[PDB]
Amino acid sequence: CTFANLWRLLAQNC
Amino acid sequence: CTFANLWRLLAQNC
Amino acid sequence: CTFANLWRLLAQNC
Amino acid sequence: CTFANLWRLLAQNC
Questions:
Q1: Best exposed site among B11, D1, D4, D7 by fewest CB in 10 Å?
Q2: Cβ-defined contact of C4 to A1 (cutoff 8 Å)
Q3: Partner A contacted by C4 (CB < 8 A)
Q4: How would DSSP label each residue in B1-14?
């Protein structure tokens, strides 16, 4: 549950 | 690319 | 400023 | 449950 994982998902989906 | 989707994908770990 | 905190704050809506 | 609210909370907390 990290900012890193948020950025990863934003990069993958947006 | 919706926040609801990302929030749900992050739910397991958060 | 932690993603865990933001995810929890957004649980109210998501 | 929106990107807009995520950004608001990021601005407030980070």
A1: D4
A2: yes
A3: yes
A4: --HHHHHHHHHTT-
On whether the CB atoms of residues A7 and B9 are closer than 8 A, the answer is no
Resolution, Å (one decimal):
1.0
B4 to chain A, closest Cα gap in Å: 12
Name the method of structure determination: X-ray
Q: Which residue pairs from D5-10 have beta carbons closer than 8 angstroms and sit at least 24 positions apart in sequence?
A: D5/B3, D5/C10, D5/C13, D6/B3, D6/C6, D6/C10, D9/C6, D9/C9, D9/C10, D10/C6
DSSP string, chain A: --HHHHHHHHHHH-
Q: How far is B10 from C3, CA to CA, in rounded Å?
A: 10
C-alpha–C-alpha distance, residues D14 and D7, integer Å: 10
